[PDB]
Amino acid sequence: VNSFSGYLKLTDNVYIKNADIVEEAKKVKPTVVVNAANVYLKHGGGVAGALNKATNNAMQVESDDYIATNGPLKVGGSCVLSGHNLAKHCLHVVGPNVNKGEDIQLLKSAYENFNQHEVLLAPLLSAGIFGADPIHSLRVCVDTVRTNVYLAVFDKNLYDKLVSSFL
Ligand SMILES: C[C@@H](CSc1nnc2[nH]cnn12)c1ccccc1
Numbered sequence: 001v002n003s004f005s006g007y008l009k010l011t012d013n014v015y016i017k018n019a020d021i022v023e024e025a026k027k028v029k030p031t032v033v034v035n036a037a038n039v040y041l042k043h044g045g046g047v048a049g050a051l052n053k054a055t056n057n058a059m060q061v062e063s064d065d066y067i068a069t070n071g072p073l074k075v076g077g078s079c080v081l082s083g084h085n086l087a088k089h090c091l092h093v094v095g096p097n098v099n100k101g102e103d104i105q106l107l108k109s110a111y112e113n114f115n116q117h118e119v120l121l122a123p124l125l126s127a128g129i130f131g132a133d134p135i136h137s138l139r140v141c142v143d144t145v146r147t148n149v150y151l152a153v154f155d156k157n158l159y160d161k162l163v164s165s166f167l
Contacts, residue, residue, distance in 0.1 A: 002119060003028050004150045010166060013148050014141060018159035021047060021123055021152040022054045025086035030150075033083055034114070034122035035059075036130065037092035039072040041079075046129040055084040063092070075102050076109035091117060098131030107137065111144040119148045128154075138162055 007015035017024070025033045036047035041063035043052035052059040062081055073079060078093040095110040096102030110125050124141065126132035134153075141149065153159040 002148075004030075004121075007150055008163060010138075011142055013146060014151065015149070016138075016151045016153060016159070016162065018154075018156050019152040020050075020154055021121065022050050022086070024150075024152050025051075025083075025121060026054065028121060030083075030087045030119065030121040032089050032091050032117045032120040033087035034120055034125075035090050035092045036123050036125065036128070037073065037078075037094050038097065039075060039077075039094050041067055041073070041092060047123045051086065051090070054086060058082075058084050059090065076106040078110075078113035087121070091120065093122075093125060095125035095130055095137075096132070097129075098126065099129070104132060104136075107132065107140050108144050111141055114141075114145045114149055115147050117147055119150070121150045121152060123152060123154075134158055134162060135165055138166065 007017045009015050035051050043060055073094050075094050075096055078091055081090050083090045093110050093113050096106040107126050114120055124134050124137040127134040127137050
């Protein structure tokens with residue numbers, strides 16, 4: 001039993017809700033919240049910009065030191081950093097950004113990072129401003145992640161379409 005509430009169960013291990021991931025994190029304080037990161041951990045907009053704002057920019061400060069020490073992530077890769085006031089940990093995962101021409105096959109590799117964590121609160125990778133089809137992202141999520149994932153979808157219209165079209 002865990003504290004995630006109001007989710008629709010899609011599969012054995014994947015759950016979905018129309019929710020603002022920021023507000024969901026602040027309420028649940030999950031062990032792991034997933035950030036829709038880029039390789040530079042520049043958290044400007046989309047999910048990343050919203051998460052970082054909720055930490056009063058502490059996520060960005062921590063991220064800049066991480067990059068100064070380690071260099072950029074790989075597309076499809078991840079790193080674990082602090083969850084600040086939102087979660088114990090933040091798993092920063094880089095899905096491919098279609099508006100940069102990145103190979104969409106890298107989406108499966110990106111979701112594989114989730115399997116290193118037993119339970120996660122997450123957005124749909126590569127959705128939103130990353131330009132991929134969120135229906136496809138949900139399919140890859142279901143077919144790749146074996147651990148327990150609670151997906152927060154900000155847009156109600158999209159949420160209803162994702163549920164109604166789910167196979
Ligand atoms: C408006 C955007 C969804 S914005 C959103 N909702 N949840 C999340 N997570 C990350 N971005 N995001 C959209 C709708 C329908 C087709 C494509 C794109």
